[PDB]
Amino acid sequence: SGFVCNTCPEKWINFQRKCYYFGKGTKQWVHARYACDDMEGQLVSIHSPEEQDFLTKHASHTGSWIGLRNLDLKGEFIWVDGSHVDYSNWAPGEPTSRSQGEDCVMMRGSGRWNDAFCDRKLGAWVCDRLATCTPPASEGSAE
């Protein structure tokens, strides 16, 4: 068994004290958020062009799922965390013409997001959660 203070091995990525999940599985957005709960995290919900690009680059064989869920379809996109989008990446500026539905947002290898029905065609689930490094706080800091 692997030691603690290090849960993110390959896909999963840890930083200052938080980690990301870029694993493979499921086939729907709702399945991604459910996966997050299993890891005790959250549906990514990327807010940094770097982070979105980070997973975007990490996701080659298939796109990735983010913490984005829209009301109906073309309405307002709200994050699974209950926070309206701030940057958004669904296409740089191409409104396309093939309108069929978009209840969630996906990420393509192109280097951004694509707003389309949660039931598109992905293969990798991504969620974020804090690292597994948390020792029992005994001595109170700053006495």
CSV table of N, CA and C in Angstrom, one decimal:
chain,number,residue,atom,x,y,z
A,1,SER,N,0.8,-1.2,0.0
A,1,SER,CA,0.0,0.0,0.0
A,1,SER,C,0.9,1.3,0.0
A,2,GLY,N,0.4,2.3,-0.7
A,2,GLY,CA,1.2,3.5,-0.8
A,2,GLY,C,1.1,4.3,0.4
A,3,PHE,N,2.1,5.1,0.7
A,3,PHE,CA,2.1,6.0,1.9
A,3,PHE,C,1.1,7.1,1.8
A,4,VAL,N,0.8,7.8,2.9
A,4,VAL,CA,-0.1,8.9,2.9
A,4,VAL,C,0.5,10.1,2.4
A,5,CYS,N,-0.2,11.3,2.6
A,5,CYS,CA,0.3,12.6,2.2
A,5,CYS,C,0.6,12.6,0.7
A,6,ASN,N,-0.1,11.6,-0.1
A,6,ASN,CA,0.1,11.5,-1.5
A,6,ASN,C,-0.9,10.6,-2.1
A,7,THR,N,-2.0,11.1,-2.5
A,7,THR,CA,-3.1,10.3,-3.1
A,7,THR,C,-3.1,10.4,-4.6
A,8,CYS,N,-2.7,11.6,-5.1
A,8,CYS,CA,-2.6,11.8,-6.6
A,8,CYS,C,-1.4,11.1,-7.1
A,9,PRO,N,-1.5,10.0,-7.9
A,9,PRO,CA,-0.4,9.3,-8.5
A,9,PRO,C,-0.1,9.7,-9.9
A,10,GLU,N,-0.9,9.3,-10.9
A,10,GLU,CA,-0.6,9.7,-12.3
A,10,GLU,C,-1.6,10.8,-12.7
A,11,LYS,N,-2.8,10.5,-13.1
A,11,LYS,CA,-3.8,11.5,-13.5
A,11,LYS,C,-3.9,12.5,-12.5
A,12,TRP,N,-4.5,12.1,-11.3
A,12,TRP,CA,-4.8,13.0,-10.2
A,12,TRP,C,-3.5,13.9,-10.0
A,13,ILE,N,-3.7,15.2,-9.7
A,13,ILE,CA,-2.6,16.1,-9.5
A,13,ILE,C,-2.8,17.0,-8.3
A,14,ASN,N,-1.8,17.0,-7.4
A,14,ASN,CA,-1.8,17.8,-6.2
A,14,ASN,C,-0.9,19.0,-6.3
A,15,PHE,N,-1.3,20.1,-5.6
A,15,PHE,CA,-0.5,21.3,-5.7
A,15,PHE,C,-0.2,21.8,-4.2
A,16,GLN,N,-0.4,23.1,-4.0
A,16,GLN,CA,-0.2,23.6,-2.6
A,16,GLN,C,-0.7,22.7,-1.5
A,17,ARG,N,-2.0,22.3,-1.7
A,17,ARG,CA,-2.6,21.5,-0.7
A,17,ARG,C,-3.9,20.9,-1.3
A,18,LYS,N,-4.2,21.2,-2.5
A,18,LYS,CA,-5.4,20.7,-3.2
A,18,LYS,C,-5.0,19.8,-4.3
A,19,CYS,N,-5.9,18.9,-4.7
A,19,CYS,CA,-5.6,17.9,-5.8
A,19,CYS,C,-6.7,17.9,-6.8
A,20,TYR,N,-6.4,17.4,-8.0
A,20,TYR,CA,-7.4,17.3,-9.0
A,20,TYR,C,-7.4,15.9,-9.5
A,21,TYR,N,-8.6,15.5,-10.0
A,21,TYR,CA,-8.8,14.1,-10.5
A,21,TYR,C,-9.0,14.1,-12.0
A,22,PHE,N,-8.1,13.5,-12.7
A,22,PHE,CA,-8.3,13.4,-14.2
A,22,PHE,C,-8.3,11.9,-14.6
A,23,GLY,N,-9.2,11.1,-13.9
A,23,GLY,CA,-9.2,9.7,-14.2
A,23,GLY,C,-10.2,9.4,-15.4
A,24,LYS,N,-10.3,8.1,-15.7
A,24,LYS,CA,-11.1,7.7,-16.9
A,24,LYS,C,-12.2,6.8,-16.4
A,25,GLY,N,-13.4,7.0,-16.9
A,25,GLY,CA,-14.6,6.2,-16.6
A,25,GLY,C,-15.9,7.0,-16.8
A,26,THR,N,-17.0,6.3,-16.5
A,26,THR,CA,-18.3,6.9,-16.7
A,26,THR,C,-18.5,7.3,-18.2
A,27,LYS,N,-19.6,8.0,-18.4
A,27,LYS,CA,-19.9,8.5,-19.8
A,27,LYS,C,-20.9,9.7,-19.7
A,28,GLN,N,-21.1,10.3,-18.6
A,28,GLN,CA,-22.0,11.4,-18.4
A,28,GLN,C,-21.5,12.4,-17.4
A,29,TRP,N,-22.1,13.6,-17.4
A,29,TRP,CA,-21.7,14.7,-16.5
A,29,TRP,C,-22.1,14.3,-15.1
A,30,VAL,N,-23.4,13.9,-14.9
A,30,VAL,CA,-23.9,13.6,-13.6
A,30,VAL,C,-23.0,12.5,-13.0
A,31,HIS,N,-22.4,11.6,-13.8
A,31,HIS,CA,-21.6,10.6,-13.4
A,31,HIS,C,-20.3,11.1,-12.8
A,32,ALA,N,-19.9,12.3,-13.4
A,32,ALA,CA,-18.6,12.9,-13.0
A,32,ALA,C,-18.7,13.5,-11.6
A,33,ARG,N,-19.8,14.2,-11.3
A,33,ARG,CA,-20.1,14.8,-10.0
A,33,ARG,C,-20.2,13.7,-9.0
A,34,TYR,N,-20.9,12.6,-9.3
A,34,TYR,CA,-21.0,11.5,-8.4
A,34,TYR,C,-19.7,10.9,-8.1
A,35,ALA,N,-18.8,10.9,-9.1
A,35,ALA,CA,-17.4,10.4,-8.9
A,35,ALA,C,-16.7,11.3,-7.9
A,36,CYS,N,-16.9,12.6,-8.0
A,36,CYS,CA,-16.3,13.6,-7.1
A,36,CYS,C,-16.7,13.2,-5.6
A,37,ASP,N,-18.0,13.0,-5.4
A,37,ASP,CA,-18.5,12.7,-4.1
A,37,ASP,C,-17.8,11.4,-3.5
A,38,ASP,N,-17.4,10.5,-4.4
A,38,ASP,CA,-16.8,9.3,-4.1
A,38,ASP,C,-15.3,9.6,-3.6
A,39,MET,N,-14.8,10.7,-4.1
A,39,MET,CA,-13.4,11.0,-3.8
A,39,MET,C,-13.4,12.1,-2.7
A,40,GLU,N,-14.6,12.6,-2.4
A,40,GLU,CA,-14.8,13.6,-1.4
A,40,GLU,C,-14.3,15.0,-1.9
A,41,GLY,N,-14.5,15.3,-3.2
A,41,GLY,CA,-14.1,16.5,-3.7
A,41,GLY,C,-15.2,17.4,-4.3
A,42,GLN,N,-15.1,17.7,-5.6
A,42,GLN,CA,-16.0,18.6,-6.2
A,42,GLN,C,-15.8,18.5,-7.7
A,43,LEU,N,-16.8,18.8,-8.5
A,43,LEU,CA,-16.6,18.7,-9.9
A,43,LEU,C,-15.8,19.9,-10.3
A,44,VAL,N,-14.6,19.6,-10.7
A,44,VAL,CA,-13.5,20.6,-11.1
A,44,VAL,C,-14.0,22.0,-11.1
A,45,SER,N,-14.8,22.4,-12.1
A,45,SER,CA,-15.3,23.8,-12.3
A,45,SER,C,-14.1,24.7,-12.5
A,46,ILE,N,-13.3,24.4,-13.5
A,46,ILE,CA,-12.1,25.2,-13.8
A,46,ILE,C,-12.4,26.7,-13.9
A,47,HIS,N,-11.6,27.5,-13.4
A,47,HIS,CA,-11.8,29.0,-13.5
A,47,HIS,C,-10.5,29.7,-14.0
A,48,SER,N,-9.5,28.9,-14.2
A,48,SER,CA,-8.2,29.4,-14.7
A,48,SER,C,-7.8,28.8,-16.0
A,49,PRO,N,-7.7,29.7,-17.1
A,49,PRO,CA,-7.3,29.3,-18.4
A,49,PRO,C,-6.2,28.2,-18.4
A,50,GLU,N,-5.3,28.3,-17.4
A,50,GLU,CA,-4.2,27.4,-17.2
A,50,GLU,C,-4.7,26.1,-16.7
A,51,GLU,N,-5.6,26.1,-15.7
A,51,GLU,CA,-6.1,24.8,-15.2
A,51,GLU,C,-6.9,24.1,-16.3
A,52,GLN,N,-7.8,24.8,-17.0
A,52,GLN,CA,-8.6,24.2,-18.0
A,52,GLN,C,-7.7,23.6,-19.1
A,53,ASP,N,-6.6,24.4,-19.4
A,53,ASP,CA,-5.6,23.9,-20.4
A,53,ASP,C,-4.8,22.8,-19.8
A,54,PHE,N,-4.6,22.8,-18.5
A,54,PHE,CA,-3.9,21.7,-17.9
A,54,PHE,C,-4.5,20.4,-18.0
A,55,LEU,N,-5.8,20.3,-17.7
A,55,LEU,CA,-6.6,19.1,-17.9
A,55,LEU,C,-6.8,18.8,-19.4
A,56,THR,N,-7.0,19.9,-20.1
A,56,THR,CA,-7.2,19.8,-21.6
A,56,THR,C,-6.0,19.1,-22.2
A,57,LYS,N,-4.8,19.4,-21.8
A,57,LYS,CA,-3.6,18.8,-22.3
A,57,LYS,C,-3.5,17.4,-21.8
A,58,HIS,N,-3.9,17.2,-20.5
A,58,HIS,CA,-3.9,15.9,-19.9
A,58,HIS,C,-4.9,15.0,-20.5
A,59,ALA,N,-6.0,15.6,-21.1
A,59,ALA,CA,-7.0,14.8,-21.7
A,59,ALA,C,-6.9,14.7,-23.2
A,60,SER,N,-6.2,13.7,-23.7
A,60,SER,CA,-5.9,13.5,-25.1
A,60,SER,C,-6.9,12.4,-25.7
A,61,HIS,N,-6.8,11.2,-25.1
A,61,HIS,CA,-7.7,10.1,-25.6
A,61,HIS,C,-9.1,10.5,-25.6
A,62,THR,N,-9.5,11.4,-24.6
A,62,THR,CA,-10.9,11.8,-24.5
A,62,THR,C,-11.0,13.1,-23.7
A,63,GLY,N,-12.0,13.9,-23.9
A,63,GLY,CA,-12.2,15.1,-23.2
A,63,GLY,C,-12.3,15.0,-21.7
A,64,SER,N,-12.7,16.0,-21.0
A,64,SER,CA,-12.9,16.0,-19.5
A,64,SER,C,-14.2,16.6,-19.1
A,65,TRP,N,-14.6,16.3,-17.9
A,65,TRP,CA,-15.8,16.9,-17.3
A,65,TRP,C,-15.5,18.0,-16.3
A,66,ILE,N,-16.2,19.1,-16.4
A,66,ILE,CA,-16.0,20.2,-15.5
A,66,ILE,C,-17.2,20.5,-14.6
A,67,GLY,N,-17.1,21.2,-13.6
A,67,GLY,CA,-18.2,21.6,-12.7
A,67,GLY,C,-19.1,22.6,-13.3
A,68,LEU,N,-19.6,22.3,-14.5
A,68,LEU,CA,-20.6,23.2,-15.1
A,68,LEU,C,-21.9,22.5,-15.5
A,69,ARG,N,-23.0,23.1,-15.1
A,69,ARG,CA,-24.3,22.6,-15.4
A,69,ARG,C,-25.2,23.8,-15.7
A,70,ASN,N,-25.8,23.8,-16.9
A,70,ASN,CA,-26.7,24.9,-17.3
A,70,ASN,C,-28.2,24.6,-17.0
A,71,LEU,N,-29.0,25.6,-16.8
A,71,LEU,CA,-30.4,25.4,-16.5
A,71,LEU,C,-31.1,24.6,-17.5
A,72,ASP,N,-31.4,25.1,-18.6
A,72,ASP,CA,-32.1,24.4,-19.7
A,72,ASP,C,-31.1,23.9,-20.7
A,73,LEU,N,-30.6,24.9,-21.5
A,73,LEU,CA,-29.7,24.6,-22.6
A,73,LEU,C,-28.9,25.8,-23.0
A,74,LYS,N,-29.6,26.8,-23.5
A,74,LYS,CA,-28.9,28.1,-23.9
A,74,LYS,C,-29.1,29.1,-22.9
A,75,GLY,N,-29.6,28.8,-21.7
A,75,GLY,CA,-29.8,29.7,-20.7
A,75,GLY,C,-28.6,30.2,-20.0
A,76,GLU,N,-28.5,30.1,-18.7
A,76,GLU,CA,-27.3,30.5,-17.9
A,76,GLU,C,-26.6,29.3,-17.4
A,77,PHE,N,-25.3,29.3,-17.5
A,77,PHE,CA,-24.5,28.2,-17.1
A,77,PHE,C,-24.0,28.4,-15.6
A,78,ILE,N,-24.4,27.4,-14.8
A,78,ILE,CA,-24.1,27.5,-13.4
A,78,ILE,C,-23.2,26.3,-12.9
A,79,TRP,N,-22.3,26.6,-12.1
A,79,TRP,CA,-21.3,25.6,-11.6
A,79,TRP,C,-22.0,24.6,-10.7
A,80,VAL,N,-21.6,23.4,-10.6
A,80,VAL,CA,-22.2,22.4,-9.7
A,80,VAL,C,-22.0,22.8,-8.3
A,81,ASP,N,-21.1,23.7,-8.0
A,81,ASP,CA,-20.8,24.2,-6.7
A,81,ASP,C,-21.9,25.3,-6.3
A,82,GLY,N,-22.7,25.6,-7.3
A,82,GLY,CA,-23.7,26.6,-7.1
A,82,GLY,C,-23.2,28.0,-7.4
A,83,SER,N,-22.3,28.2,-8.3
A,83,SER,CA,-21.7,29.5,-8.6
A,83,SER,C,-21.7,29.7,-10.1
A,84,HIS,N,-22.3,30.8,-10.6
A,84,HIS,CA,-22.4,31.1,-12.0
A,84,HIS,C,-21.0,31.2,-12.6
A,85,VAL,N,-20.9,30.9,-13.9
A,85,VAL,CA,-19.6,31.0,-14.5
A,85,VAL,C,-18.9,32.3,-14.4
A,86,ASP,N,-17.6,32.4,-14.5
A,86,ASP,CA,-16.9,33.7,-14.4
A,86,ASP,C,-16.1,33.9,-15.7
A,87,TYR,N,-15.5,32.9,-16.2
A,87,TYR,CA,-14.6,33.0,-17.4
A,87,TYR,C,-15.3,32.3,-18.6
A,88,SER,N,-15.7,31.1,-18.4
A,88,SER,CA,-16.3,30.2,-19.5
A,88,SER,C,-15.3,30.0,-20.6
A,89,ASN,N,-15.4,28.9,-21.3
A,89,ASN,CA,-14.5,28.5,-22.4
A,89,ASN,C,-15.2,27.9,-23.6
A,90,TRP,N,-16.5,27.6,-23.4
A,90,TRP,CA,-17.3,27.0,-24.5
A,90,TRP,C,-17.0,27.8,-25.8
A,91,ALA,N,-16.1,27.3,-26.6
A,91,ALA,CA,-15.7,27.9,-27.9
A,91,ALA,C,-15.2,29.3,-27.7
A,92,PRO,N,-14.1,29.7,-28.4
A,92,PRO,CA,-13.6,31.0,-28.3
A,92,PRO,C,-14.6,32.1,-28.7
A,93,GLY,N,-15.3,31.8,-29.8
A,93,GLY,CA,-16.3,32.8,-30.3
A,93,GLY,C,-17.1,32.2,-31.4
A,94,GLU,N,-17.2,30.9,-31.5
A,94,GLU,CA,-18.0,30.3,-32.6
A,94,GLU,C,-19.3,29.7,-32.0
A,95,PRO,N,-20.4,30.4,-32.3
A,95,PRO,CA,-21.8,30.0,-31.9
A,95,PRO,C,-22.3,28.8,-32.6
A,96,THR,N,-21.5,28.4,-33.6
A,96,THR,CA,-21.9,27.2,-34.4
A,96,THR,C,-23.3,27.4,-35.0
A,97,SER,N,-23.9,26.2,-35.5
A,97,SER,CA,-25.2,26.3,-36.0
A,97,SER,C,-25.9,25.0,-35.7
A,98,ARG,N,-25.2,24.0,-35.2
A,98,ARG,CA,-25.8,22.7,-34.9
A,98,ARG,C,-26.3,22.7,-33.5
A,99,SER,N,-27.5,23.4,-33.3
A,99,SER,CA,-28.1,23.5,-32.0
A,99,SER,C,-29.0,22.3,-31.7
A,100,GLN,N,-28.7,21.5,-30.6
A,100,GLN,CA,-29.5,20.4,-30.3
A,100,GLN,C,-29.7,20.3,-28.8
A,101,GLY,N,-28.9,21.0,-28.0
A,101,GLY,CA,-29.0,21.0,-26.6
A,101,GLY,C,-27.6,21.1,-25.9
A,102,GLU,N,-27.7,21.7,-24.7
A,102,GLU,CA,-26.4,21.9,-23.9
A,102,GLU,C,-26.7,22.1,-22.4
A,103,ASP,N,-26.7,21.0,-21.6
A,103,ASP,CA,-27.0,21.1,-20.2
A,103,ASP,C,-25.7,21.1,-19.4
A,104,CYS,N,-24.6,20.8,-20.0
A,104,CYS,CA,-23.3,20.8,-19.3
A,104,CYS,C,-22.2,21.1,-20.3
A,105,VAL,N,-21.0,21.3,-19.7
A,105,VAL,CA,-19.9,21.7,-20.5
A,105,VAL,C,-18.8,20.7,-20.5
A,106,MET,N,-18.2,20.4,-21.7
A,106,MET,CA,-17.1,19.5,-21.8
A,106,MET,C,-15.8,20.2,-22.3
A,107,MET,N,-14.7,19.4,-22.2
A,107,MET,CA,-13.5,20.0,-22.7
A,107,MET,C,-12.8,19.2,-23.8
A,108,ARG,N,-12.4,19.8,-24.9
A,108,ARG,CA,-11.8,19.2,-26.0
A,108,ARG,C,-10.3,19.4,-26.0
A,109,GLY,N,-9.6,18.5,-26.8
A,109,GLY,CA,-8.2,18.6,-26.9
A,109,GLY,C,-7.8,19.9,-27.6
A,110,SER,N,-8.7,20.6,-28.2
A,110,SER,CA,-8.4,21.8,-28.9
A,110,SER,C,-7.7,22.8,-28.0
A,111,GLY,N,-8.1,22.8,-26.7
A,111,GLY,CA,-7.5,23.7,-25.8
A,111,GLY,C,-8.5,24.5,-25.1
A,112,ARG,N,-9.8,24.1,-25.1
A,112,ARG,CA,-10.8,24.8,-24.4
A,112,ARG,C,-12.0,23.9,-24.1
A,113,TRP,N,-13.2,24.6,-23.9
A,113,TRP,CA,-14.4,23.9,-23.6
A,113,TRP,C,-15.4,23.9,-24.8
A,114,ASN,N,-16.3,23.0,-24.7
A,114,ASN,CA,-17.4,23.0,-25.7
A,114,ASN,C,-18.7,22.8,-24.9
A,115,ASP,N,-19.6,23.7,-25.1
A,115,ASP,CA,-20.9,23.7,-24.4
A,115,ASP,C,-21.9,22.8,-25.2
A,116,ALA,N,-22.2,21.7,-24.6
A,116,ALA,CA,-23.2,20.8,-25.2
A,116,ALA,C,-23.8,19.8,-24.2
A,117,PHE,N,-24.9,19.2,-24.6
A,117,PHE,CA,-25.7,18.3,-23.7
A,117,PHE,C,-24.7,17.4,-22.9
A,118,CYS,N,-25.0,17.2,-21.7
A,118,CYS,CA,-24.1,16.4,-20.8
A,118,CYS,C,-23.9,15.0,-21.4
A,119,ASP,N,-24.8,14.6,-22.3
A,119,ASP,CA,-24.8,13.3,-22.9
A,119,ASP,C,-24.2,13.4,-24.3
A,120,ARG,N,-22.9,13.8,-24.4
A,120,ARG,CA,-22.2,14.0,-25.7
A,120,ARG,C,-21.4,12.7,-26.0
A,121,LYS,N,-20.2,12.7,-25.6
A,121,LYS,CA,-19.3,11.5,-25.9
A,121,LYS,C,-17.9,11.7,-25.3
A,122,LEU,N,-17.8,11.5,-24.0
A,122,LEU,CA,-16.6,11.7,-23.3
A,122,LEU,C,-16.1,10.3,-22.8
A,123,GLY,N,-15.1,10.3,-21.9
A,123,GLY,CA,-14.6,9.0,-21.4
A,123,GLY,C,-13.7,9.2,-20.2
A,124,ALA,N,-13.5,10.4,-19.7
A,124,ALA,CA,-12.6,10.7,-18.5
A,124,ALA,C,-13.4,11.6,-17.5
A,125,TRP,N,-13.4,11.1,-16.3
A,125,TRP,CA,-14.0,11.9,-15.2
A,125,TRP,C,-13.0,12.7,-14.4
A,126,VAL,N,-13.3,13.9,-14.2
A,126,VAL,CA,-12.4,14.8,-13.4
A,126,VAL,C,-13.1,15.6,-12.3
A,127,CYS,N,-12.5,15.5,-11.1
A,127,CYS,CA,-13.0,16.2,-9.9
A,127,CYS,C,-11.9,16.7,-9.1
A,128,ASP,N,-12.1,17.6,-8.2
A,128,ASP,CA,-11.0,18.1,-7.4
A,128,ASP,C,-11.3,17.9,-5.9
A,129,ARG,N,-10.3,17.6,-5.1
A,129,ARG,CA,-10.3,17.4,-3.7
A,129,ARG,C,-9.0,17.7,-3.1
A,130,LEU,N,-9.0,18.1,-1.8
A,130,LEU,CA,-7.8,18.4,-1.1
A,130,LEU,C,-7.0,17.1,-0.9
A,131,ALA,N,-5.6,17.3,-0.9
A,131,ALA,CA,-4.7,16.1,-0.7
A,131,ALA,C,-5.1,15.3,0.5
A,132,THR,N,-4.4,14.1,0.7
A,132,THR,CA,-4.7,13.2,1.8
A,132,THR,C,-3.7,13.5,2.9
A,133,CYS,N,-3.1,14.7,2.9
A,133,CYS,CA,-2.1,15.1,3.9
A,133,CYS,C,-2.7,16.0,5.0
A,134,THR,N,-3.1,15.5,6.1
A,134,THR,CA,-3.8,16.3,7.2
A,134,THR,C,-3.5,15.6,8.5
A,135,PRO,N,-2.4,15.9,9.2
A,135,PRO,CA,-2.1,15.4,10.5
A,135,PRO,C,-3.0,15.9,11.6
A,136,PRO,N,-3.3,15.1,12.6
A,136,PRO,CA,-4.2,15.5,13.8
A,136,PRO,C,-3.6,16.8,14.4
A,137,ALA,N,-4.4,17.9,14.3
A,137,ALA,CA,-4.0,19.2,14.9
A,137,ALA,C,-4.1,19.1,16.4
A,138,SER,N,-3.0,19.1,17.1
A,138,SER,CA,-3.0,19.0,18.5
A,138,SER,C,-2.7,20.4,19.1
A,139,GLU,N,-1.5,20.9,18.9
A,139,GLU,CA,-1.0,22.2,19.4
A,139,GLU,C,-1.6,23.3,18.6
A,140,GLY,N,-2.4,24.1,19.2
A,140,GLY,CA,-3.1,25.2,18.5
A,140,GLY,C,-2.1,26.3,18.1
A,141,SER,N,-2.1,26.6,16.8
A,141,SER,CA,-1.2,27.6,16.2
A,141,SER,C,-1.5,29.0,16.8
A,142,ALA,N,-0.4,29.7,17.0
A,142,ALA,CA,-0.5,31.1,17.5
A,142,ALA,C,-1.3,31.1,18.9
A,143,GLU,N,-0.5,30.8,19.9
A,143,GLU,CA,-1.1,30.7,21.3
A,143,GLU,C,-1.2,32.1,21.9
